[PDB]
Scaffold this motif. Structure first.
Motif, PDB file in Angstrom:
ATOM      1  N   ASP A 170      37.021  11.920  50.999  1.00 18.27           N
ATOM      2  CA  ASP A 170      37.756  11.767  52.248  1.00 18.27           C
ATOM      3  C   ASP A 170      38.821  12.851  52.272  1.00 18.27           C
ATOM      4  O   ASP A 170      39.820  12.755  51.555  1.00 18.27           O
ATOM      5  CB  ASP A 170      38.386  10.379  52.360  1.00 18.27           C
ATOM      6  N   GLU A 171      38.610  13.879  53.088  1.00 17.44           N
ATOM      7  CA  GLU A 171      39.547  14.989  53.164  1.00 17.44           C
ATOM      8  C   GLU A 171      40.622  14.782  54.222  1.00 17.44           C
ATOM      9  O   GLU A 171      41.536  15.607  54.329  1.00 17.44           O
ATOM     10  CB  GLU A 171      38.787  16.295  53.418  1.00 17.44           C
ATOM     11  N   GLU A 172      40.553  13.692  54.986  1.00 14.12           N
ATOM     12  CA  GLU A 172      41.603  13.405  55.958  1.00 14.12           C
ATOM     13  C   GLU A 172      42.792  12.721  55.288  1.00 14.12           C
ATOM     14  O   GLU A 172      43.895  13.276  55.232  1.00 14.12           O
ATOM     15  CB  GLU A 172      41.045  12.544  57.095  1.00 14.12           C
ATOM     16  N   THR A 173      42.580  11.520  54.751  1.00 15.31           N
ATOM     17  CA  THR A 173      43.666  10.726  54.203  1.00 15.31           C
ATOM     18  C   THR A 173      43.348  10.314  52.769  1.00 15.31           C
ATOM     19  O   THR A 173      42.228   9.851  52.485  1.00 15.31           O
ATOM     20  CB  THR A 173      43.927   9.501  55.098  1.00 15.31           C
ATOM     21  N   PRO A 174      44.280  10.497  51.833  1.00 12.71           N
ATOM     22  CA  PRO A 174      44.027  10.078  50.448  1.00 12.71           C
ATOM     23  C   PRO A 174      43.818   8.574  50.345  1.00 12.71           C
ATOM     24  O   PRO A 174      44.404   7.788  51.093  1.00 12.71           O
ATOM     25  CB  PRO A 174      45.291  10.512  49.692  1.00 12.71           C
ATOM     26  N   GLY A 175      42.974   8.179  49.394  1.00 13.76           N
ATOM     27  CA  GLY A 175      42.744   6.777  49.108  1.00 13.76           C
ATOM     28  C   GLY A 175      43.302   6.365  47.760  1.00 13.76           C
ATOM     29  O   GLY A 175      43.396   5.172  47.455  1.00 13.76           O
ATOM     30  N   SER A 240      58.134   2.131  47.831  1.00 14.79           N
ATOM     31  CA  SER A 240      58.848   0.920  47.466  1.00 14.79           C
ATOM     32  C   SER A 240      57.862  -0.223  47.252  1.00 14.79           C
ATOM     33  O   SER A 240      56.689  -0.144  47.624  1.00 14.79           O
ATOM     34  CB  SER A 240      59.856   0.543  48.551  1.00 14.79           C
ATOM     35  N   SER A 241      58.352  -1.307  46.646  1.00 16.59           N
ATOM     36  CA  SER A 241      57.520  -2.500  46.530  1.00 16.59           C
ATOM     37  C   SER A 241      57.301  -3.151  47.887  1.00 16.59           C
ATOM     38  O   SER A 241      56.300  -3.850  48.088  1.00 16.59           O
ATOM     39  CB  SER A 241      58.147  -3.494  45.559  1.00 16.59           C
ATOM     40  N   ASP A 242      58.224  -2.933  48.826  1.00 18.20           N
ATOM     41  CA  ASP A 242      58.044  -3.443  50.179  1.00 18.20           C
ATOM     42  C   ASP A 242      56.854  -2.795  50.867  1.00 18.20           C
ATOM     43  O   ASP A 242      56.251  -3.400  51.757  1.00 18.20           O
ATOM     44  CB  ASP A 242      59.315  -3.216  50.995  1.00 18.20           C
ATOM     45  N   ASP A 243      56.501  -1.570  50.472  1.00 11.78           N
ATOM     46  CA  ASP A 243      55.333  -0.897  51.022  1.00 11.78           C
ATOM     47  C   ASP A 243      54.031  -1.366  50.393  1.00 11.78           C
ATOM     48  O   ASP A 243      52.957  -0.953  50.843  1.00 11.78           O
ATOM     49  CB  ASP A 243      55.457   0.618  50.836  1.00 11.78           C
ATOM     50  N   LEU A 244      54.093  -2.197  49.362  1.00 17.03           N
ATOM     51  CA  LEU A 244      52.899  -2.606  48.640  1.00 17.03           C
ATOM     52  C   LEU A 244      52.376  -3.894  49.251  1.00 17.03           C
ATOM     53  O   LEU A 244      53.081  -4.907  49.279  1.00 17.03           O
ATOM     54  CB  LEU A 244      53.191  -2.792  47.153  1.00 17.03           C
ATOM     55  N   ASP A 245      51.140  -3.860  49.738  1.00 17.97           N
ATOM     56  CA  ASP A 245      50.625  -5.040  50.414  1.00 17.97           C
ATOM     57  C   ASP A 245      50.088  -6.060  49.425  1.00 17.97           C
ATOM     58  O   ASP A 245      50.357  -7.258  49.559  1.00 17.97           O
ATOM     59  CB  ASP A 245      49.551  -4.641  51.423  1.00 17.97           C
ATOM     60  N   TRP A 246      49.354  -5.613  48.412  1.00 15.20           N
ATOM     61  CA  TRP A 246      48.685  -6.548  47.525  1.00 15.20           C
ATOM     62  C   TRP A 246      48.729  -6.049  46.090  1.00 15.20           C
ATOM     63  O   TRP A 246      48.572  -4.853  45.829  1.00 15.20           O
ATOM     64  CB  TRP A 246      47.235  -6.772  47.959  1.00 15.20           C
ATOM     65  N   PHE A 247      48.940  -6.981  45.169  1.00 19.64           N
ATOM     66  CA  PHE A 247      48.959  -6.706  43.738  1.00 19.64           C
ATOM     67  C   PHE A 247      47.763  -7.405  43.114  1.00 19.64           C
ATOM     68  O   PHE A 247      47.675  -8.636  43.145  1.00 19.64           O
ATOM     69  CB  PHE A 247      50.265  -7.185  43.100  1.00 19.64           C
ATOM     70  N   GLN A 303      45.609  -0.774  53.951  1.00 17.96           N
ATOM     71  CA  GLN A 303      46.683  -1.411  53.204  1.00 17.96           C
ATOM     72  C   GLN A 303      46.839  -0.773  51.825  1.00 17.96           C
ATOM     73  O   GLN A 303      45.894  -0.212  51.263  1.00 17.96           O
ATOM     74  CB  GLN A 303      46.417  -2.909  53.064  1.00 17.96           C
ATOM     75  N   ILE A 304      48.052  -0.863  51.281  1.00 17.76           N
ATOM     76  CA  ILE A 304      48.360  -0.308  49.966  1.00 17.76           C
ATOM     77  C   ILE A 304      48.143  -1.386  48.912  1.00 17.76           C
ATOM     78  O   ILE A 304      48.717  -2.479  48.999  1.00 17.76           O
ATOM     79  CB  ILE A 304      49.798   0.232  49.908  1.00 17.76           C
ATOM     80  N   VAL A 305      47.323  -1.078  47.909  1.00 17.15           N
ATOM     81  CA  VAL A 305      46.931  -2.037  46.884  1.00 17.15           C
ATOM     82  C   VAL A 305      47.214  -1.435  45.517  1.00 17.15           C
ATOM     83  O   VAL A 305      47.033  -0.230  45.307  1.00 17.15           O
ATOM     84  CB  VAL A 305      45.441  -2.427  47.014  1.00 17.15           C
ATOM     85  N   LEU A 306      47.673  -2.273  44.591  1.00 20.23           N
ATOM     86  CA  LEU A 306      47.930  -1.882  43.210  1.00 20.23           C
ATOM     87  C   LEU A 306      46.965  -2.654  42.323  1.00 20.23           C
ATOM     88  O   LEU A 306      47.110  -3.869  42.151  1.00 20.23           O
ATOM     89  CB  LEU A 306      49.382  -2.155  42.812  1.00 20.23           C
ATOM     90  N   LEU A 307      45.979  -1.955  41.773  1.00 12.94           N
ATOM     91  CA  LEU A 307      45.082  -2.525  40.778  1.00 12.94           C
ATOM     92  C   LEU A 307      45.596  -2.162  39.394  1.00 12.94           C
ATOM     93  O   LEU A 307      45.839  -0.982  39.109  1.00 12.94           O
ATOM     94  CB  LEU A 307      43.655  -2.005  40.948  1.00 12.94           C
ATOM     95  N   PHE A 308      45.758  -3.168  38.538  1.00 12.94           N
ATOM     96  CA  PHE A 308      46.259  -2.953  37.180  1.00 12.94           C
ATOM     97  C   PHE A 308      45.295  -3.604  36.199  1.00 12.94           C
ATOM     98  O   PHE A 308      45.397  -4.799  35.898  1.00 12.94           O
ATOM     99  CB  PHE A 308      47.669  -3.487  37.012  1.00 12.94           C
ATOM    100  N   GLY A 309      44.358  -2.806  35.692  1.00 13.74           N
ATOM    101  CA  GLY A 309      43.416  -3.282  34.706  1.00 13.74           C
ATOM    102  C   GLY A 309      43.922  -2.971  33.313  1.00 13.74           C
ATOM    103  O   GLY A 309      44.275  -1.830  33.012  1.00 13.74           O
ATOM    104  N   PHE A 310      43.958  -3.998  32.469  1.00 11.24           N
ATOM    105  CA  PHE A 310      44.369  -3.881  31.082  1.00 11.24           C
ATOM    106  C   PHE A 310      43.446  -4.748  30.248  1.00 11.24           C
ATOM    107  O   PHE A 310      42.907  -5.741  30.735  1.00 11.24           O
ATOM    108  CB  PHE A 310      45.830  -4.323  30.881  1.00 11.24           C
ATOM    109  N   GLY A 311      43.275  -4.383  28.989  1.00 11.42           N
ATOM    110  CA  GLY A 311      42.457  -5.200  28.123  1.00 11.42           C
ATOM    111  C   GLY A 311      42.446  -4.700  26.702  1.00 11.42           C
ATOM    112  O   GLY A 311      43.342  -3.968  26.273  1.00 11.42           O
TER     113      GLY A 311
END
Lengths: 325, 326
Positions: A170-175, A240-247, A303-311
């Protein structure tokens, strides 16, 4: 500056359910103990004859039925798993066998529960560098076949599922907005499953080839690692965290996620999980959480999403992404 | 879409015990003459009873570090191509981090069998060119002797153990990666396999006993039809001819297979680096060993154009045109 975006999703969970009532009846535990310590009520179990590749194919079929474009284009298949059918051929090659795509690389990857976000990190770099266009990032696990069902502390946690994410140029908007990574190899004896070797520090491993975890030490490591790298992610992306829609953390344990949500300043109501009816599905936990959210209307395009995979490792990859579907 | 990566250092370690053709004569009904004729191998290295893939890899990074002018403290990614990791999910790459204690790195194991090295460099090139990483260790390590059936004379003579590491880092001056080609033939899965959780493939029960299984003829047939045309396609993608390329470094599976590829792709065997003779088939490691044999011997010099072609169980492959940055 990322040129990659996540544009499709699919998930499959096997049909057989393992309830807490079923677990009270094989190990000495109770529905109330389980739901209070972990937050899970059910898990899905693969059939005797269906394996991780069978789950990954189903997950891609689901994506295929839900994606407005074609998948003949796919030029890389990344499968994150720990319960592969064979040492080789890899599960990614089984997926290619089934759909028959004509010119694609195929690779299994192993970061255990962080495998999915590791796979998405890889796809982002391969696409953004202009090496790939359509990439399938798949997580599928058959935890039930490597679970010690004589152990109350672990057999109540694990389920089976697979999930698939499609990533495109996607060369228009970063994902992809930012990424954090780290490895704590010293924790290798805190979360493990035996393979060719059966000792860590000259100390014989327990579990007889089944998964083994020091639940408290894992919990403690997640609790002291995720909040700071959470913050570091937002800083890297200028957000900011206010800009983060989903964790969407790895859905290992609802109390752990609750704890993480307090130590980090982030609300549980902005947190997507999959632990209640699917248990802990290792690298698939995050995909399941996303698809439940997609089906429920909570997760929407841009929407802005934060995926945090750990293991196991211990190791992790944290991702700030922009939903592109 | 210009690459911003270059391979800048190398290190290898091969286990101590040598497994000669004579040794294999007292194990299975075979002869030294049949082995050197059918495969070209003389010796293999065998890991000790208590040394495993992660041990070998650590020894390989030790070799690289003792040969690299820079530091490894800022390595930000470890990729370990392996089919024989110490543990199922405790990642061999994470065992490598634990030993050296690097402070901020990702660790990931990857599985593409004998193609894992080239896949690992392909990943590193994209991970660095996209600006997500600066310095990556691409490690291949295998303990094939532990997964080898030493009652099958057709297969147990082939395999050895070794480890090798390559360092890839940012080079905004000139690219160290010039072209890539990839492909997968999933239906060839039953041609080269090892049982894991599953012990049947499209219906029929697997053979061996959790040990590695190969149809050497069909593996030969694939690759003999696959590698030549992809060889040429690599050159076209990079805008080069066969005369621009100095060294060809295919998966060192079988010297007869290598000679035959060189026969039907138009490229001379005297320009191809191998490691089968004294190390056997070390799967994902075979290319690094051929590379390190060539640098020690003075044959592989910096800025030389070299083609790596890892193909393996899958069936899958990745072929790379690279400029030696060391």
């Amino acid at each position: 500056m990322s040129k990659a975006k996540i544009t499709a999703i699919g998930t499959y969970a096997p049909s057989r359910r393992l309830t807490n009532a079923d677990l009270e009846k094989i190990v000495d535990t109770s529905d109330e103990w389980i739901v209070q310590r972990t937050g899970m009520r059910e898990r899905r179990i693969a059939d005797e004859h269906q394996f991780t590749s069978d789950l990954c194919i189903e997950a891609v079929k689901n994506l295929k039925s839900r994606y407005k474009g074609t998948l003949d284009d796919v030029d890389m298949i990344l499968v994150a798993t720990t319960t592969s059918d064979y040492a080789f051929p890899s599960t990614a090659c089984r997926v290619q066998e089934y759909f028959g795509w004509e010119s694609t690389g195929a690779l299994d990857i192993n970061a255990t529960c962080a495998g999915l976000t590791y796979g998405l990190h890889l796809a982002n770099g391969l696409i953004t560098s202009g090496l790939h266009q359509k990439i399938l990032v798949i997580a599928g696990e058959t935890l039930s076949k490597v679970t010690d069902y004589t152990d109350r502390t672990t057999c109540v946690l694990f389920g089976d599922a697979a999930g698939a994410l499609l990533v495109e140029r996607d060369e228009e908007t970063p994902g992809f907005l930012a990424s954090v990574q780290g490895t704590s190899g010293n924790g290798g004896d805190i979360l493990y499953r035996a393979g060719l070797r059966n000792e860590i520090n000259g100390v014989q491993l327990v579990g007889s080839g089944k998964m083994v975890q020091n639940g408290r030490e894992v919990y403690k490591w997640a609790a002291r690692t995720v909040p700071g790298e959470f913050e570091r992610l937002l800083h890297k992306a200028g957000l900011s965290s206010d800009d983060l829609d989903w964790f969407v953390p790895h859905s290992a344990n609802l109390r752990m996620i609750e704890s993480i949500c307090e130590k980090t300043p982030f609300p549980i109501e902005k947190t997507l999980t999959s632990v209640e009816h699917y248990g802990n599905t290792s690298s698939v936990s995050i995909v399941l959480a996303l698809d439940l959210a997609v089906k429920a209307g909570k997760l929407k395009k841009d929407q802005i999403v934060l995926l945090f995979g750990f293991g196991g490792g211990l190791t992790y990859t944290g991702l700030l992404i922009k939903w592109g579907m």
